[PDB]
Design a protein around this motif. Structure first.
Motif, PDB file in Angstrom:
ATOM      1  N   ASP A 163     -25.331 -68.464 -45.729  1.00  6.82           N
ATOM      2  CA  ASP A 163     -25.933 -68.807 -44.446  1.00  6.82           C
ATOM      3  C   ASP A 163     -26.464 -67.566 -43.701  1.00  6.82           C
ATOM      4  OD1 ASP A 163     -25.554 -71.672 -44.760  1.00  6.82           O
ATOM      5  OD2 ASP A 163     -23.497 -71.465 -44.036  1.00  6.82           O
ATOM      6  N   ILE A 164     -26.088 -67.362 -42.442  1.00  6.85           N
ATOM      7  CA  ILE A 164     -26.971 -66.706 -41.484  1.00  6.85           C
ATOM      8  C   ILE A 164     -27.175 -65.232 -41.750  1.00  6.85           C
ATOM      9  CG2 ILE A 164     -27.221 -66.025 -39.029  1.00  6.85           C
ATOM     10  CD1 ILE A 164     -26.333 -68.768 -38.237  1.00  6.85           C
ATOM     11  N   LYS A 165     -26.094 -64.455 -41.672  1.00  6.88           N
ATOM     12  CA  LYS A 165     -26.121 -62.987 -41.891  1.00  6.88           C
ATOM     13  C   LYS A 165     -27.058 -62.557 -43.012  1.00  6.88           C
ATOM     14  CE  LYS A 165     -23.172 -61.128 -38.932  1.00  6.88           C
ATOM     15  NZ  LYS A 165     -23.058 -61.744 -37.585  1.00  6.88           N
ATOM     16  N   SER A 166     -26.936 -63.260 -44.143  1.00  4.24           N
ATOM     17  CA  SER A 166     -27.665 -62.950 -45.357  1.00  4.24           C
ATOM     18  C   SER A 166     -29.133 -63.296 -45.227  1.00  4.24           C
ATOM     19  CB  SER A 166     -27.060 -63.693 -46.548  1.00  4.24           C
ATOM     20  OG  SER A 166     -27.452 -65.047 -46.554  1.00  4.24           O
ATOM     21  N   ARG A 167     -29.411 -64.489 -44.711  1.00  2.00           N
ATOM     22  CA  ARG A 167     -30.783 -64.952 -44.463  1.00  2.00           C
ATOM     23  C   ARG A 167     -31.556 -64.148 -43.417  1.00  2.00           C
ATOM     24  NH1 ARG A 167     -29.199 -71.373 -43.864  1.00  2.00           N
ATOM     25  NH2 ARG A 167     -29.317 -71.914 -46.096  1.00  2.00           N
ATOM     26  N   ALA A 168     -30.904 -63.245 -42.686  1.00  2.77           N
ATOM     27  CA  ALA A 168     -31.625 -62.242 -41.872  1.00  2.77           C
ATOM     28  C   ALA A 168     -31.393 -60.824 -42.378  1.00  2.77           C
ATOM     29  CB  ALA A 168     -31.224 -62.334 -40.405  1.00  2.77           C
ATOM     30  N   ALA A 169     -30.837 -60.688 -43.585  1.00  3.54           N
ATOM     31  CA  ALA A 169     -30.514 -59.376 -44.151  1.00  3.54           C
ATOM     32  C   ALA A 169     -31.781 -58.727 -44.740  1.00  3.54           C
ATOM     33  CB  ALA A 169     -29.437 -59.512 -45.210  1.00  3.54           C
ATOM     34  N   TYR A 170     -32.695 -58.331 -43.849  1.00  9.19           N
ATOM     35  CA  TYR A 170     -34.000 -57.874 -44.267  1.00  9.19           C
ATOM     36  C   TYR A 170     -33.870 -56.602 -45.094  1.00  9.19           C
ATOM     37  CZ  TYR A 170     -35.785 -61.011 -40.557  1.00  9.19           C
ATOM     38  OH  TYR A 170     -36.073 -62.074 -39.779  1.00  9.19           O
ATOM     39  N   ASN A 171     -34.313 -56.647 -46.347  1.00  8.59           N
ATOM     40  CA  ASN A 171     -34.239 -55.466 -47.247  1.00  8.59           C
ATOM     41  C   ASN A 171     -35.543 -54.647 -47.306  1.00  8.59           C
ATOM     42  OD1 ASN A 171     -35.632 -57.319 -48.767  1.00  8.59           O
ATOM     43  ND2 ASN A 171     -33.955 -57.734 -50.201  1.00  8.59           N
ATOM     44  N   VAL A 172     -36.626 -55.192 -46.770  1.00  6.83           N
ATOM     45  CA  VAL A 172     -37.950 -54.566 -46.904  1.00  6.83           C
ATOM     46  C   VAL A 172     -38.841 -54.950 -45.739  1.00  6.83           C
ATOM     47  CG1 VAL A 172     -37.924 -54.739 -49.471  1.00  6.83           C
ATOM     48  CG2 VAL A 172     -39.063 -56.529 -48.108  1.00  6.83           C
ATOM     49  N   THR A 173     -39.967 -54.261 -45.603  1.00  7.24           N
ATOM     50  CA  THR A 173     -41.064 -54.768 -44.814  1.00  7.24           C
ATOM     51  C   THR A 173     -42.375 -54.365 -45.457  1.00  7.24           C
ATOM     52  OG1 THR A 173     -42.311 -54.609 -42.737  1.00  7.24           O
ATOM     53  CG2 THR A 173     -40.768 -52.840 -43.249  1.00  7.24           C
ATOM     54  N   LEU A 174     -43.347 -55.273 -45.395  1.00  6.12           N
ATOM     55  CA  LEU A 174     -44.664 -55.057 -45.904  1.00  6.12           C
ATOM     56  C   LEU A 174     -45.557 -54.851 -44.698  1.00  6.12           C
ATOM     57  CD1 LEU A 174     -46.428 -54.981 -48.469  1.00  6.12           C
ATOM     58  CD2 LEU A 174     -46.632 -57.423 -48.201  1.00  6.12           C
ATOM     59  N   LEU A 175     -46.105 -53.642 -44.587  1.00  2.69           N
ATOM     60  CA  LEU A 175     -47.028 -53.297 -43.518  1.00  2.69           C
ATOM     61  C   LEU A 175     -48.451 -53.608 -43.925  1.00  2.69           C
ATOM     62  CD1 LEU A 175     -44.406 -51.870 -42.853  1.00  2.69           C
ATOM     63  CD2 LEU A 175     -45.819 -49.943 -42.057  1.00  2.69           C
ATOM     64  N   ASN A 176     -49.321 -53.910 -42.967  1.00  2.00           N
ATOM     65  CA  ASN A 176     -50.719 -54.317 -43.258  1.00  2.00           C
ATOM     66  C   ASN A 176     -51.681 -53.698 -42.318  1.00  2.00           C
ATOM     67  OD1 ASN A 176     -50.164 -56.859 -45.052  1.00  2.00           O
ATOM     68  ND2 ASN A 176     -48.677 -56.754 -43.383  1.00  2.00           N
ATOM     69  N   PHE A 177     -52.914 -53.493 -42.772  1.00  2.00           N
ATOM     70  CA  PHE A 177     -54.011 -53.051 -41.912  1.00  2.00           C
ATOM     71  C   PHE A 177     -55.327 -53.756 -42.270  1.00  2.00           C
ATOM     72  CE2 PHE A 177     -57.356 -49.963 -40.778  1.00  2.00           C
ATOM     73  CZ  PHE A 177     -57.184 -50.013 -39.403  1.00  2.00           C
ATOM     74  N   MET A 178     -56.169 -54.043 -41.276  1.00  2.00           N
ATOM     75  CA  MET A 178     -57.481 -54.667 -41.537  1.00  2.00           C
ATOM     76  C   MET A 178     -58.474 -54.391 -40.406  1.00  2.00           C
ATOM     77  SD  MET A 178     -59.022 -57.671 -43.190  1.00  2.00           S
ATOM     78  CE  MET A 178     -60.285 -58.838 -42.663  1.00  2.00           C
ATOM     79  N   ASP A 179     -59.781 -54.356 -40.757  1.00  2.00           N
ATOM     80  CA  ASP A 179     -60.931 -54.032 -39.860  1.00  2.00           C
ATOM     81  C   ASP A 179     -60.832 -52.528 -39.550  1.00  2.00           C
ATOM     82  OD1 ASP A 179     -62.668 -56.269 -39.749  1.00  2.00           O
ATOM     83  OD2 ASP A 179     -61.764 -57.141 -37.958  1.00  2.00           O
ATOM     84  N   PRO A 180     -61.846 -51.863 -38.974  1.00  2.00           N
ATOM     85  CA  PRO A 180     -62.936 -52.436 -38.163  1.00  2.00           C
ATOM     86  C   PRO A 180     -64.103 -53.105 -38.917  1.00  2.00           C
ATOM     87  CG  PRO A 180     -62.520 -50.067 -37.689  1.00  2.00           C
ATOM     88  CD  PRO A 180     -61.938 -50.390 -39.024  1.00  2.00           C
ATOM     89  N   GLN A 181     -64.317 -54.394 -38.626  1.00  2.00           N
ATOM     90  CA  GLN A 181     -65.385 -55.256 -39.190  1.00  2.00           C
ATOM     91  C   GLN A 181     -65.983 -54.817 -40.535  1.00  2.00           C
ATOM     92  OE1 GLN A 181     -67.673 -55.341 -35.613  1.00  2.00           O
ATOM     93  NE2 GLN A 181     -66.445 -57.001 -34.718  1.00  2.00           N
ATOM     94  N   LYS A 182     -65.119 -54.263 -41.385  1.00  2.00           N
ATOM     95  CA  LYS A 182     -65.517 -53.706 -42.665  1.00  2.00           C
ATOM     96  C   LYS A 182     -65.852 -54.826 -43.627  1.00  2.00           C
ATOM     97  CE  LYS A 182     -63.284 -50.560 -45.129  1.00  2.00           C
ATOM     98  NZ  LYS A 182     -61.925 -50.845 -45.691  1.00  2.00           N
ATOM     99  N   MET A 183     -65.439 -56.057 -43.312  1.00  2.00           N
ATOM    100  CA  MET A 183     -65.809 -57.208 -44.125  1.00  2.00           C
ATOM    101  C   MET A 183     -67.211 -57.691 -43.782  1.00  2.00           C
ATOM    102  SD  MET A 183     -64.009 -58.159 -46.638  1.00  2.00           S
ATOM    103  CE  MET A 183     -64.464 -59.870 -46.846  1.00  2.00           C
ATOM    104  N   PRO A 184     -68.175 -57.532 -44.725  1.00  2.00           N
ATOM    105  CA  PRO A 184     -69.609 -57.806 -44.428  1.00  2.00           C
ATOM    106  C   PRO A 184     -69.928 -59.244 -43.941  1.00  2.00           C
ATOM    107  CG  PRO A 184     -69.270 -57.265 -46.794  1.00  2.00           C
ATOM    108  CD  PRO A 184     -67.956 -57.075 -46.122  1.00  2.00           C
TER     109      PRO A 184
END
Ligand code: 7YC
Ligand code: ZN
Length: 421
Positions: free
Chosen positions: A127-148
């Motif tokens: 249950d709870i403790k484990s289901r919030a036991a975050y082992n990682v994070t995936l960071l993201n970036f997008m734009d400036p309006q680089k998508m044509p």
């Protein structure tokens, strides 16, 4: 037509409450301004160092570069498989140097959210403790309006999206996800939103939550499975940190290390040389070895090296480990060869004692198919376009000449001849 809801609608609020109660939002207001500065600085340090790369996915038959560029940060040794690519953690201090500071930050960020998540998950079951036991994070970036030209949301007329509808996959069952949105500066097209729909369901109008600098949302419990989400794009660019609980049974260094040792139990291990001899040829043990040979080769080495000079720009953490798996794997070639040398052996009831055939042939054809697949993707046309620091390496690679290797990169011959037996 096709409809959606924003805070601009009255229905929105009860729609949220009755059909998305597992989706939680905590606005920038609710978060330490100390922490806000630190993670926003950490995004920038990271961006400035060029740590965030587009990924050359191979989705549904076709090679694609992701609009969004990303880095995974998290536990040392952990991996996270995303659209057939296995991202490896640039690590954080669980118990060059600007970078290590950002990884710290994101741990702090991690721990904070973890608290918020526990809290809301209590307030939820209420249950709870484990289901919030975050082992990682995936960071993201997008734009400036680089998508044509950017893709239109096709069902609810939410307009342009950065990331189409999907589920975040390869997570622990019923596990949560927390997300810090850093925007730097119908639905407002200039503002970034997370979008939500019920899976399969195209006619319950979807929900489009504006995200302003520092806002945070949470997918609790089975939400991510029951629902889909996408990201609608803004006018400016955006960063995000999306903390997950990856299911990393089979997806950590220690796991894969053990698997290798398990396989090298069938070798007489007095000395590291090219006389590779084996303790048995009970097919079951040979199955297992040749499977493990595949596992380390394709799930770790080829996959790591496809990402090329990427990680060394962030960290040297994986160098020793990845060199070691190469050595471990090289020896497993040794065993294949040995297993070959034992089938084509004068004695041995070369009849009946060819279960050492139906034990391995799958494993070896699969070795051939995958080897072609990874060669192809490394020198396909799209892979040249990529930068010289980024472009995929097809490693480990050796020519039919190359002596040190006891077997060829293959093409087929062997596998043909083993069909023939
Ligand atoms: N969504 C997502 C994001 C990653 C992602 C993860 C997956 O497992 C996956 O299958 C896909 N995918 O199929 O495009 C994306 C993401 O990073 N985000 C979206 C929300 C806020 O912040 C950024
Ligand atoms: Zn997602």
């Amino acid at each position: 037509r096709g409809s959606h809801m924003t805070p601009k609608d009255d229905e929105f609020y009860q729609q949220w409450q009755l059909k998305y109660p597992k989706l939680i939002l905590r606005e920038a207001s609710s978060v330490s301004e100390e922490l806000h500065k630190e993670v926003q600085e950490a995004f920038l340090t990271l961006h400035k160092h060029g740590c965030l790369f587009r990924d050359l996915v191979r989705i549904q038959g076709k090679d694609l570069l992701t609009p969004v560029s990303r880095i995974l940060i998290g536990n040392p040794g952990c991996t996270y498989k995303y659209l057939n690519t296995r991202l490896f953690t640039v690590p954080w201090p669980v118990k060059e140097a600007e970078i290590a500071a950002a990884c710290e930050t994101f741990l702090k960020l991690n721990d904070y959210l973890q608290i918020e998540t526990i809290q809301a998950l209590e307030e939820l079951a209420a249950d709870i403790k484990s289901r919030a036991a975050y082992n990682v994070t995936l960071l993201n970036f997008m734009d400036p309006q680089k998508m044509p030209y950017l893709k239109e949301e096709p069902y609810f007329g939410m307009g342009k999206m950065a990331v189409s509808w999907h589920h975040d996959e390869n997570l622990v069952d019923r596990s949560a996800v927390a997300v810090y949105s850093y925007s730097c500066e119908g639905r407002d097209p200039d503002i970034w939103h997370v979008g939500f729909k019920i899976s399969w369901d195209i006619e319950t109008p979807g929900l489009a939550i504006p995200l302003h600098q520092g806002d945070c949302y949470f997918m609790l419990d089975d939400l991510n499975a029951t629902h889909q989400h996408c990201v609608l794009a803004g006018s400016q660019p955006r960063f995000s940190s999306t903390h997950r609980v990856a299911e990393c049974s089979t997806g950590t260094l220690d796991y894969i290390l053990q698997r290798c040792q398990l396989a090298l139990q069938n070798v007489c291990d007095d000395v590291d040389n090219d006389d590779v001899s084996l303790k048995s040829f009970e097919p079951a043990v040979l199955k297992q070895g040749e499977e493990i040979h595949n596992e380390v080769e394709f799930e770790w080495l080829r996959q790591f090296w496809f990402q090329g000079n990427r990680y060394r720009k962030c960290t040297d953490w994986w160098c020793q480990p990845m060199a070691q798996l190469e050595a471990l794997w090289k020896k497993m070639e040794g065993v294949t060869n040995a297993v070959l040398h034992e089938v084509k052996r004068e004695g041995l009831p070369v009849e009946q004692r060819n279960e050492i055939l139906t034990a391995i042939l799958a494993s070896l054809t699969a070795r051939q198919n995958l080897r072609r697949e990874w060669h192809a993707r490394c020198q396909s046309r799209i892979a040249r376009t990529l930068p010289a620091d980024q472009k995929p390496e097809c490693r480990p690679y050796w020519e039919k000449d190359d002596a040190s290797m006891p077997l060829p990169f293959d093409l087929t011959d062997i596998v043909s001849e083993l069909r023939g037996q």
